[PDB]
Amino acid sequence: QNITEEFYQSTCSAVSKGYLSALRTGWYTSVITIELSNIKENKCNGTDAKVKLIKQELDKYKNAVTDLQLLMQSTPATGSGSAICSGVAVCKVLHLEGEVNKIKSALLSTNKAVVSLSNGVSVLTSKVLDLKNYIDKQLLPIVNKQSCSIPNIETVIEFQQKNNRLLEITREFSVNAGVTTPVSTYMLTNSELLSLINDMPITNDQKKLMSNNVQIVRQQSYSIMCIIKEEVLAYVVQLPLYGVIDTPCWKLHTSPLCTTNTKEGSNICLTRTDRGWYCDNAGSVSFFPQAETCKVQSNRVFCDTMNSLTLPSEVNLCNVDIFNPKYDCKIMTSKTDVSSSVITSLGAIVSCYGKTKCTASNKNRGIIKTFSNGCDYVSNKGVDTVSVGNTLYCVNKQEGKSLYVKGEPIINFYDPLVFPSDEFDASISQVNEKINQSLAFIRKS
Amino acid sequence: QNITEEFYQSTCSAVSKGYLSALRTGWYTSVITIELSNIKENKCNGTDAKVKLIKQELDKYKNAVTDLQLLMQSTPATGSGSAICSGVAVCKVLHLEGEVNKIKSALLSTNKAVVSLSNGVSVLTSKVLDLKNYIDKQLLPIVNKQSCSIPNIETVIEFQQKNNRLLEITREFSVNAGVTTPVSTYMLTNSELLSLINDMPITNDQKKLMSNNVQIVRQQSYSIMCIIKEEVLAYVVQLPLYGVIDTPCWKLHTSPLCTTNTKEGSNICLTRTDRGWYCDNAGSVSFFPQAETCKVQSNRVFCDTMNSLTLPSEVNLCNVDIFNPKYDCKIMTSKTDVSSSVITSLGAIVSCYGKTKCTASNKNRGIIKTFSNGCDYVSNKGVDTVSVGNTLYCVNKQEGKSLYVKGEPIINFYDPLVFPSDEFDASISQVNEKINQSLAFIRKS
Amino acid sequence: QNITEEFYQSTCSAVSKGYLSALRTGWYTSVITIELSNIKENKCNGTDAKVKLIKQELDKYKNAVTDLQLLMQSTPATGSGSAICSGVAVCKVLHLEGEVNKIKSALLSTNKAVVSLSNGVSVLTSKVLDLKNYIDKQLLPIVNKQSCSIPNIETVIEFQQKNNRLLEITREFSVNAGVTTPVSTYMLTNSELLSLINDMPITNDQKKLMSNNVQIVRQQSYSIMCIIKEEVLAYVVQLPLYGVIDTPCWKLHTSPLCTTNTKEGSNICLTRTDRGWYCDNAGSVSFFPQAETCKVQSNRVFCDTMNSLTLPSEVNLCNVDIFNPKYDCKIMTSKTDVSSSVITSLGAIVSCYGKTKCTASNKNRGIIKTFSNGCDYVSNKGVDTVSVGNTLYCVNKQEGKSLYVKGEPIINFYDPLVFPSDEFDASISQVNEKINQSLAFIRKS
Numbered sequence A, B, C: 001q002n003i004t005e006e007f008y009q010s011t012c013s014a015v016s017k018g019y020l021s022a023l024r025t026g027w028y029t030s031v032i033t034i035e036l037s038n039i040k041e042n043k044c045n046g047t048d049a050k051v052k053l054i055k056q057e058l059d060k061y062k063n064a065v066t067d068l069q070l071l072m073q074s075t076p077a078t079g080s081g082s083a084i085c086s087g088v089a090v091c092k093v094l095h096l097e098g099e100v101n102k103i104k105s106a107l108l109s110t111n112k113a114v115v116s117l118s119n120g121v122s123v124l125t126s127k128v129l130d131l132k133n134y135i136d137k138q139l140l141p142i143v144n145k146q147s148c149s150i151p152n153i154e155t156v157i158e159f160q161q162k163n164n165r166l167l168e169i170t171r172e173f174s175v176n177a178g179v180t181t182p183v184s185t186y187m188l189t190n191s192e193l194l195s196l197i198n199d200m201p202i203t204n205d206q207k208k209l210m211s212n213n214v215q216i217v218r219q220q221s222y223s224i225m226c227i228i229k230e231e232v233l234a235y236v237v238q239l240p241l242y243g244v245i246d247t248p249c250w251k252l253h254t255s256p257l258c259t260t261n262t263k264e265g266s267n268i269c270l271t272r273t274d275r276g277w278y279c280d281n282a283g284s285v286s287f288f289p290q291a292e293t294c295k296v297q298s299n300r301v302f303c304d305t306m307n308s309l310t311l312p313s314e315v316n317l318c319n320v321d322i323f324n325p326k327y328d329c330k331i332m333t334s335k336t337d338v339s340s341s342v343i344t345s346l347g348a349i350v351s352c353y354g355k356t357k358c359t360a361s362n363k364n365r366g367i368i369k370t371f372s373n374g375c376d377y378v379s380n381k382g383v384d385t386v387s388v389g390n391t392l393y394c395v396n397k398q399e400g401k402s403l404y405v406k407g408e409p410i411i412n413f414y415d416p417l418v419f420p421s422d423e424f425d426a427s428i429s430q431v432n433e434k435i436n437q438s439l440a441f442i443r444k445s
């Protein structure tokens, strides 16, 4: 994939092109079980040091089970309810009588198994930890008599190792009110996640996509606590299904565009708004305004469409003609005599104003470019850093082609006397009507 | 508790009612001690593998103590100073000579004990870990001679388990400059927190409230590091006292209300501001503008009044008459031809504009409602999801009654030519004076 | 250092003076190596409990190595690229053939060593964990034959302890796409960080500065994953170099300034903008608008100049004469009949409006000051808390001198009829031109 960039001198904005989409549009739920031991406290006149270590680890196991129980007695509402109704439907199905027995029977001989629940959902279940078998076979002979049997020291170490995953899963589920994201290796080991991906009802390119980007998959997944019932701890892992794949995506970068008069109080400014990620999606454009909601890897963007707005494809014409009548290109006009810079995919936009010292350097050649007052741009070819005032930024050294599209700054087309300055959420046509209305009060006068 | 909701078609806003408050108004401080061992390094010609393991764990203990020491030599200021003066007053009292000896003497025979400090505060102290007794009884005979004694392997495991809590407490206190929130199970185990709640000078309903919502209590608590002095590590846990209980609380949801003309550039919009949580409090209303500052459980809201504004109770009349002269109902008027949705407690508000495809579906019946252009609403009765453009939201399936309050959208009462569009922080009366002022320039002309 | 404060009654703002700077201007990169064992799976008819524990820990080691391998096959782009080009240049140099052999040879006999890479960077390398020596000397004799040798139980415990740091480093590098900040004790122990500081090519006062503020140094550092190659795991720790030291720094606090007419709808307001941290820097002022980007210790501020704007030193004259022609003092004018408070370094600003009950109390004397309507201030001398409505704030009890600079509130100099209210990003001169333009439409009429 070839990454290219285009700087528009007329609007002080840049577009980084050539990116491929992977937008989340669906969910795949899966049940993760941990087999627990329904045991009660036994005291057996025990004092041997190995028995003490075992009972200590057993009390940490009992407190972990009761803590998970108080999590299902009262579950605090979360801000994620608009994205977890699928996993929640699976957890509500699990509360029916006989359904946990159903997954418990299917996982009697194997760790993984497909189970058709009583709500029409054919989920993939697995058993990642078996504490009922371990406690009842290796531990119960110790606390289960008049005097305690002595366990070997290997059992003490193996049980602290096995019980550890229960304690960390209980910690993540406890602090997050039963809904965690991202999904940690405690909730699902990388081996278990990759094995779950291979067994999903998805295409082979989608298994290769999710398997090569497991950390992004984890960051776009949810782990939801279901129930502790009948010696079973069940929780749902909700994994993303990327319904939009390989559609063009581009990132818009914007910076203030002011006039450069030498007398303060006579300058006006404008800045394009709605900078962020754009991806073609189903005849429209999916826009991602928050900056961290889209993870980038090698020219592929992984977004969740729940963090998007749906815009007409004509929004791209703000990049080709900001004065274009098919879409009303949005701007803001607060004045700004302060310098700033934006590091793009293949270069840097610099808005230099006032007395600020703006420059672009190469590590071994020194200063190779000095920006004048106004908005300018430099590619990463031969440039390592950009300095604005007392701040030094690093330019991304990724390969690609930049194109400097020369053009007159549109802020110069505006009469300062009637310019509407201080517009927070405006548009090109909004500014033009405010100019026609301020010009009519002078036309009559 | 019955949750109800009301959608106001006239203002594109909804109010979710029926919630009970629990607002934090006071603090209960408590001292948590860890008994340390004032020991120095001893080298004893040791090479046996068990001795090596013990000295390794002992060096991790010494580095944890010196790290806590450099935390009290220089404590970085935190953004939490406006909420921890109570716990800080207890830590400053502890620095007096003889006060740490006082808590150290009261906890000579028991783990928990009430102590009257020299500043008039009767605090509940406890001793959650005893490393001085363990190191001096089980470890000192090993490093304390010409040649080292051999410890049994159970001691090596028990000491790594005991020293672990010191290392994790030191890690949380080190990365957070001595002030951590929420309070982790390392700072205070769930068993210790519940035991502390039972012993507090609070009513039995307040102990039941805090004990049934321990994770919310932890998230609204602070752990403050006090001192390492004379073989004692002391830190304060500051727990919330919920002075406002069972007062009505409601959540306001707002969405843009535009006109739906078919020609772009001729539409105006308004949006109610100050969406969030409202609770009746002491003759006024406590408003919570940040969304995540109030945790919800089963119809109970748990807020910290430090994240609130105090408003007159007439602010509720924006929900009954936005044109009401007792309170100046605030709005913003930026234009917005972009569609959006808000998931409420019992349904969903949809602002559909332009060509956006807005719908509400049931999982098995399909699309059951198509929104027209404008602001509309649908209850969760029979609805599972809402789709706006390329985005699908899940509707909360909580039981309650919704009421659709029909009314003419107030944006239709405004002449577009003189509407003040692009108002960031405005009000209904603010907009009306700007309309009277723009109408006077035309009245004379 | 003497901390002083100045409240300006005329503009409802305060300046906390007397702070010394430490601004980050450069980076010092360092290579951290972990010697790994290139081993493949061996199965040896083993069933003894100690052998099982060892093979389990060995599988967790192999999955940690393959997980780090999939992190270097595909590295997701991060939002930190503008600040890590130095460490990234070191990681790219490491990918050259023979360069990892170079650091591997220099660290053949010692843990720490200076290495001149093939890109002109003289970095300090160290070897914090040696798993190749441990696995090949203590573990290989177990899995390396027809039947497995039996390890002693001390080896099982020592290997779980040693392998633990690899698993936690792999976890932090996995969830963060190879770039972590702050730098944890797993990436670099406090002992290793202090040893690295002592060996840096910096002055003795800078080593004392960074050694006394290690947690702030960690929070302003980066750990970047380099490569797993030829039995070596290498990653770069990028530590801050504080190029600006002991320059004056001050913190500006602002609060709304309204008129106090008794009839709602007749009041206007203004609020100074650009509250935050200011530090003198290289003939200009470095301004830090985000509040948490500057850590404060004992009168020293530690900022990263990447989170700053560069302003002329005349910006300080907004504190002495807001009407001063050398710098256009910025304000916003949204109306606000809501009360609020700002806790400063030595007191509290209170903006009391409407019916709000504002007061300042001492813990033992009770209410000692009642604020009237308007903007006022109280020092921390004798004051413990400030209550505004239903909210109680704690006043910082730090010693210093406050100065109450009396003056007429400038909002009273404005005619309400022509005031531009609802200005989002304005200035004193911006407001004056809007008043001259609204007065010209009345002058002719």
Ligand SMILES: *[C@@H]1O[C@H](CO)[C@@H](O)[C@H](O)[C@H]1NC(C)=O
Residues within 6 Å of the ligand: A429, A430, A432, A433, A434, A436
């Ligand atoms: C301003 O007036 C000109 C002249 O008739 C017209 O062509 C233009 O469309 C007007 N602008 C707006 C935004 O109405």
Ligand SMILES: *[C@@H]1O[C@H](CO)[C@@H](O)[C@H](O)[C@H]1NC(C)=O
Residues within 6 Å of the ligand: B429, B430, B432, B433, B434, B436
């Ligand atoms: C606008 O003018 C009308 C007509 O006198 C008056 O009743 C109304 O109060 C005015 N609005 C404002 C906000 O002053």
Ligand SMILES: *[C@@H]1O[C@H](CO)[C@@H](O)[C@H](O)[C@H]1NC(C)=O
Residues within 6 Å of the ligand: C429, C430, C432, C433, C434, C436
């Ligand atoms: C407003 O008019 C006065 C009178 O001439 C003038 O002195 C002042 O500079 C003007 N203000 C602005 C911002 O132009």
